[PDB]
Design a protein around this ligand. Structure first.
Ligand SMILES: CCC1=C(C)/C(=C/C2=NC(=C\c3[nH]c(/C=C4\NC(=O)[C@H](C)[C@H]4CC)c(C)c3CCC(=O)O)/C(CCC(=O)O)=C2C)NC1=O
Ligand SMILES: CCC1=C(C)/C(=C/C2=NC(=C\c3[nH]c(/C=C4\NC(=O)[C@H](C)[C@H]4CC)c(C)c3CCC(=O)O)/C(CCC(=O)O)=C2C)NC1=O
Ligand SMILES: CCC1=C(C)/C(=C/C2=NC(=C\c3[nH]c(/C=C4\NC(=O)[C@H](C)[C@H]4CC)c(C)c3CCC(=O)O)/C(CCC(=O)O)=C2C)NC1=O
Ligand SMILES: CCC1=C(C)/C(=C/C2=NC(=C\c3[nH]c(/C=C4\NC(=O)[C@H](C)[C@H]4CC)c(C)c3CCC(=O)O)/C(CCC(=O)O)=C2C)NC1=O
Ligand SMILES: CCC1=C(C)/C(=C/C2=NC(=C\c3[nH]c(/C=C4\NC(=O)[C@H](C)[C@H]4CC)c(C)c3CCC(=O)O)/C(CCC(=O)O)=C2C)NC1=O
Ligand SMILES: CCC1=C(C)/C(=C/C2=NC(=C\c3[nH]c(/C=C4\NC(=O)[C@H](C)[C@H]4CC)c(C)c3CCC(=O)O)/C(CCC(=O)O)=C2C)NC1=O
Ligand SMILES: CCC1=C(C)/C(=C/C2=NC(=C\c3[nH]c(/C=C4\NC(=O)[C@H](C)[C@H]4CC)c(C)c3CCC(=O)O)/C(CCC(=O)O)=C2C)NC1=O
Ligand SMILES: CCC1=C(C)/C(=C/C2=NC(=C\c3[nH]c(/C=C4\NC(=O)[C@H](C)[C@H]4CC)c(C)c3CCC(=O)O)/C(CCC(=O)O)=C2C)NC1=O
Lengths: 49, 48, 160, 161, 160, 160, 161, 161, 160, 161, 161
């Protein structure tokens, strides 16, 4: 059980983290993250009808 | 030989049982052979 | 076992075993080595099976392991996996016996009253058992996995 | 069984005595505590399950008793044990209402010591289960009733040892 | 008592006392001091009640103290009033218990068979019991006299 | 009621009722006017009692209004307070009759089976009822608050 | 069974209604007659045997009913008949205390018409035995209670016919 | 055997407890009656023979018991019976001094019921012989000691029946 | 104590103890074994300081043990010597506490009202209290006698 | 409130006892630890702000508590929370100086559990804030005082749970 | 508050009635006893202190109440208790002058039962202190006034119990 509790992110809500004495890693990208309005090309043509 | 038990508690007997009631009365209720000033400031109960 | 069950019905009706009863003893005993192999595999992976049931459980019910949860804390969780270890053991017994007599007297008759007292949520214990089915079943051939699966689903059934 | 009102009558009947002053004083000593006995029974009854749970937690489980080789191992035997606990609690509540332990002898203690010896049921461990329920009961029922409830739990436990 | 009669219902259904059962114990016990006073008054006048009951009885039916009478003579009479003293005692017990359990086991169950053997005339006895009501009732307040009277009429009823 | 309970016991024995039993009924009649008044008072503040009970409940047990909780969400919470409104109503019925009687038939016999099916945690329903006791009891005089409190503690008892 | 008070509670429970003004008025109409019901029951109970005796004397015996060929011929059947009479009297006393006839249906009338047809028990003669006990009862209980006792005897008798 | 004092010591020894207030109160209740027990024993001992003689005269002889076919017929059996009587008297005097009945069980009652069944010795008649000696004893020893002597005669007699 | 007085000031200004306050607790506690020893001398001679006080008190003002005197008679005197025993006791308490908190709540706040009611002459009482100083002080070393004397003079101070 | 010196006096006053040997031993046990209590208070007082800062950093902030939806979200509530923290620290310092927890009951715990339930203040999170300040305190005050400071933080935290 | 006279005026005012014969008879029944009420008040007032002293002496002091552990232990509490006594005496004197108990409810009884429960003040003991002052008062005021003074002491004492 240490591993399950600890060694595992587990399920709270969602979501986590980034904070004291601290942090986690999955990398990042500055112009990587997709802007929110958010989407597609061809949504534009296809959106209308 | 099986060991016997006891079915009558010994303080439920008549002579002993009545000498225990008398024992209570004397200590709680009353004073003594020491000077009255000392006996007049005594608490019968002790913790209540 | 299959033997005990057949006999008890025989004796209670004051009679020798039926052709049917004799047939099932024969089919049962023929599956002996296979049933013993199914128990061995699962006995051999017991520590892994509990760890994966326990992860599957706490994702599905993070609350049990939450402030007002029966399994909240490190040692309230330790006892919870120990109970999961108990039931896997009983499942190996059932598989080698070919029925539930042993599983039943040891860990379902009285289980409602026990867990109600401890205030353990019964249906989440049933989930812990489904979780063990999923892990155990991934270490067995198709045919053996089904045969094992009946006994897991029984325990899940009895906690109900 | 007998209760304080009934015991006074049968104790005098065998002597063929009218109830006299000494008898009447005894019965008063019961009636004067009666309302308090009732309130205490309503607390115990309505907290029955919690008393058993807290008594088992302090005196039985988390132990070798509940582990393989222990007498309250198996859901079967765990169930039988807390079933017993409920008997004790329930009957002690009867004894305390009646103000007489005679029911604890007639319907609970008679043969029980040997029954437990014959099954292997641990006596000392059962007494602790009784004296833990008493502890819980004495908190829940309050000053009014604590001493009176307590004695019939103590009657039960010296009946086994 | 009310307790004995009622708890018995609790134990027989394997349960704690009902709100109803608890309520009646409470109302019953509240009516205690009064019942004790009713028994005291009657205990205090027992010799008068018996003697005056005995005169009232032999007027209403003398033949019993005559040549061929069951109570003929000084010591055959010393026994008839003694039986009247017995029943008054049991009536005081009943009043303080609030029911007949004690009265019944001590002096009505078996009473037909006892008196039939002695060939005491039982039905004369009921009238004798009735006379005691009249005397006892004249030493009690209206309310207490009624409460006492129920227990006298019970005994009169049971010898029937 | 007190009437129904007394009578049913009478008829079972097939004998007219007693004269000290004509005592509980008499007590109940006097009590009933007060009892009727308490129920009316409880009825007047029902919406406040339920709502404040519901806050007291979710602080003490936030897990039921959480991801894997029986009362998680706005309409799973709406039904939960409606059930709290049901039980307060039954408590007013119980108080007025003087005997619990009808409430049992309406809302405890079968309640384990109902809530087990819905997967509702029974002991947290018992908490919701304690919470209502606390609120209701603060709107009643000491004497009336106790009389009401017995019926709240009964429901708490029956969900057990 | 139900009485006046539980009749109202169950009628509102099925609608899930708190008791309202109309309900509260009904319950008052019961409570306000309650003391009188009790006194009447104590008269009936304590005169039980005399009521049966006077009712039988006016409406059953000295007749073909008690003669050979009659249904209350034989000590066996005479005993069964006045046994029945006691039931009626006793239950009517319950109905009148409760202020509700529901007990007379549940525990007395249900199947009784056909039971009597099956044994040959004369229905019309039994009704007269009921309406004679009512007559006696109405004298003994007085102005206060006469109408209220009477109705449950009338309930009984139109339940058979 | 045990007396008042060793009864308490052994009850505490099994719990390994030093004597506490409750224990000390019990022992006082014995010591405070002690001088009276001694005086009573000296009366019984010195009137031993007369007590047996008066007890036999009221409860045994002048009867079928002493006439051919009776169990105390023959000088042989008459001697055995009053020999027994002396045992009872003597041991009851021990029990009363000790303030504990345990000696009456260990050295008198154990097996005696069946011994008497096996020889044919009439039990009911023997009890009357015990309760007659009690009657005499209670006169001789006086107010001080009457109740205390009496109980161990009553212990003896309910031990046989 | 010094603490009860040395903390109350802290809490009332919403703050931790000062260096000064900490220092005095320090110095005070260092004088513990010794202060305990001055209060043991006085319990030894508890009834002998009191008897001796009684005499001095009545020379300096006898009238109190005379026809119209508050302490006239054997049991009106037993009470007076008993009050002197009370105050010596409180003085031993004060010495071991290092201040008057205990002495004050037990025997000066309310003392005017008590004695005015009894019409014991209070001012005679101060002289009586003063006499005890004289006796007690003659059983203590110079240094300990002064330390004790402060507490005697306090009561003398309050008392009036 | 009461302190060790004062408690000894009031505990004896209610029994009307002079201070005796047992009392005098208790008071010594306080005086003998007194200088150390003072030094410890001066460390806590003068590091007050840093203890709160380090305790919040280990047990409260960088979390959902300080985020929208959390109870210490908003500068208002963050301020109220560390205000509370200062109370706890300050009063625990009083309790430890007094050598008595009574002030923690009278002026801090009484009603606080329900006050927090009523506002929604998270109890478990507050306890961690208490046990983190204890951790820091125990480092700063040293061997001399660590155990004595610690207990009144533990008193506070089992007072809420 | 209200007295005899304003009790009547307000009872008629709510009906908007001029005073009629029944009203006028009530007021006469007050005026006709008025001079006697005044004399009685002058006796009570001028013996106030002696009544308290004699009432305390018969019903409070020389007891466990005034000893350590007792509620009137300490000069503080003894003073508070006889202070209370003076209130009762003084207000009862007002009620008796007014010929109306309403002032005893408005300014003395309201909340007092619970105030005493909250402080621990013994209710039964306080009632005896009231009924002892009544006893003294009834001697001092004489035949004329005894019954009239007495009732407002009895009003006070059933107001607490
Ligand atoms: C072989 C038959 C058998 C079983 C199964 C058994 C179970 C069992 N589970 C226990 C506790 C427990 N069991 C759990 C289990 C859980 N908590 C949850 O929320 C989950 C639903 C679940 C894990 C899947 C927890 C949390 C406790 C601790 C409860 C407490 O201490 O109050 C205890 C008491 C502790 C002890 O003394 O051992 C027993 C006896 N005993 C038996 O003889
Ligand atoms: C109405 C009065 C009454 C009582 C009290 C009663 C007790 C009782 N306890 C029993 C067994 C038992 N009793 C226990 C009790 C315990 N196990 C432990 O380890 C603990 C020390 C203890 C609980 C605190 C257990 C485990 C058994 C089962 C023994 C078996 O497996 O056969 C049995 C044998 C029949 C059965 O199993 O139900 C009886 C009759 N019976 C009665 O009629
Ligand atoms: C074959 C089975 C059987 C029997 C025996 C029987 C008896 C019987 N006896 C009756 C009356 C009676 N029977 C008696 C008899 C007696 N009076 C005494 O004092 C003596 C003790 C006794 C004569 C030896 C009397 C006086 C009445 C009239 C009572 C009345 O009208 O109130 C009646 C009511 C009158 C009637 O309608 O006939 C019946 C039915 N009925 C039956 O079906
Ligand atoms: C608790 C409610 C209840 C009622 C009311 C009841 C009635 C009842 N009446 C019965 C018979 C009877 N009932 C009567 C009644 C009468 N004979 C006459 O001629 C008159 C008209 C009438 C009396 C006024 C008789 C004579 C029988 C016996 C029939 C037979 O011989 O089998 C029987 C058949 C079983 C038996 O003989 O006891 C029942 C059950 N049973 C019940 O459980
Ligand atoms: C077959 C063997 C055998 C014998 C001998 C025997 C004798 C015997 N003699 C008795 C009395 C008696 N026996 C006597 C005899 C005598 N008085 C004298 O002074 C003379 C010396 C002597 C006549 C020669 C007397 C006077 C009594 C009455 C004593 C009493 O009642 O206290 C009694 C008690 C009365 C009774 O219940 O019968 C018995 C049993 N019992 C037996 O089983
Ligand atoms: C610890 C705080 C405290 C004190 C001091 C106290 C004193 C006290 N002194 C009393 C009486 C008394 N006290 C005295 C004392 C004296 N007579 C004289 O003339 C002298 C001036 C003086 C002795 C120096 C006397 C004579 C009585 C009896 C008065 C009476 O019974 O009327 C009584 C009433 C008797 C009783 O019930 O105990 C109390 C309560 N009670 C307390 O709780
Ligand atoms: C909506 C009202 C509101 C505000 C504003 C708020 C601020 C806030 N700022 C924080 C930290 C912080 N804030 C800063 C900000 C700065 N550092 C600098 O030097 C600059 C002057 C400044 C940026 C302009 C830094 C550096 C920390 C980390 C400090 C630490 O972890 O010790 C934290 C603790 C971390 C956390 O748990 O979130 C809070 C709660 N909280 C609130 O509820
Ligand atoms: C002298 C003794 C004393 C104490 C201890 C005390 C506590 C106290 N804390 C309060 C609120 C509060 N207390 C907190 C505390 C916290 N928030 C969190 O998330 C953390 C878990 C925790 C800090 C560790 C918060 C956030 C509030 C504000 C609640 C609101 O917004 O109304 C209030 C309501 C009044 C106010 O807002 O000031 C009181 C009285 N009051 C007192 O008189």
């Amino acid at each position: 059980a240490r591993e399950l509790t600890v060694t595992p992110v587990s399920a709270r809500r969602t979501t986590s983290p980034t904070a004291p004495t601290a942090p986690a890693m999955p990398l990042a990208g500055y112009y990587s993250r997709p802007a929110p309005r958010a989407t597609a090309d061809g949504d534009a043509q296809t959106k209308l009808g | 030989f099986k060991p016997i038990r006891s079915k009558m508690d010994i303080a439920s007997m008549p002579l002993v049982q009545a000498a225990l009631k008398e024992q209570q009365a004397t200590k709680t209720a009353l004073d003594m052979s020491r000077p009255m000033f000392l006996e007049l400031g005594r608490s019968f109960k002790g913790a209540d | 076992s299959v033997l005990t069950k057949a006999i008890v019905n025989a004796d209670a009706e004051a009679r020798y075993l039926s052709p049917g009863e004799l047939d099932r003893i024969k089919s049962f005993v023929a599956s002996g080595e296979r049933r013993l192999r199914i128990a061995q595999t699962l006995t051999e992976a017991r520590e892994r099976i509990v760890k994966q049931a326990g992860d599957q459980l706490f994702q599905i019910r993070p609350d049990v392991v939450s402030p007002g949860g029966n399994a909240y804390g490190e040692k309230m969780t330790a006892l919870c996996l120990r109970d999961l270890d108990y039931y896997l053991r009983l499942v190996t017994y059932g598989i080698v016996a070919g029925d539930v007599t042993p599983i039943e007297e040891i860990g379902i008759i009285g289980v409602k009253e026990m867990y109600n007292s401890l205030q353990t949520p019964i249906p989440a214990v049933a989930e812990g058992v489904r979780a063990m089915k999923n892990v155990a079943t991934s270490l067995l051939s198709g045919d053996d996995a089904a045969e094992a699966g009946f006994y897991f689903d029984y325990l899940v059934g009895a906690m109900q | 069984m007998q209760d304080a009102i009934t015991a006074v009558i049968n104790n005098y009947d065998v002597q063929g005595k009218y109830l006299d002053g000494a008898a009447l004083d005894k019965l008063k000593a019961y009636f004067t505590t009666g309302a308090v006995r009732v309130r205490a029974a309503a607390v115990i009854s309505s907290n029955a399950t919690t008393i058993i749970k807290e008594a088992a937690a302090k005196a039985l489980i988390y132990s070798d008793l509940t582990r393989p080789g222990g007498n309250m191992y198996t859901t079967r035997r765990y169930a039988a044990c807390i079933r017993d606990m409920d008997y004790f609690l329930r009957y002690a509540t009867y004894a305390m209402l009646a103000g007489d332990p005679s029911i604890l002898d007639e319907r609970v203690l008679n043969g029980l010591k040997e029954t437990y010896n014959s099954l292997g049921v641990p006596i000392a461990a059962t007494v602790g289960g009784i004296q833990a329920m008493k502890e819980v009961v004495g908190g829940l029922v309050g000053p009014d009733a604590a001493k009176e409830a307590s004695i019939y739990f103590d009657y039960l436990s010296s009946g086994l040892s």
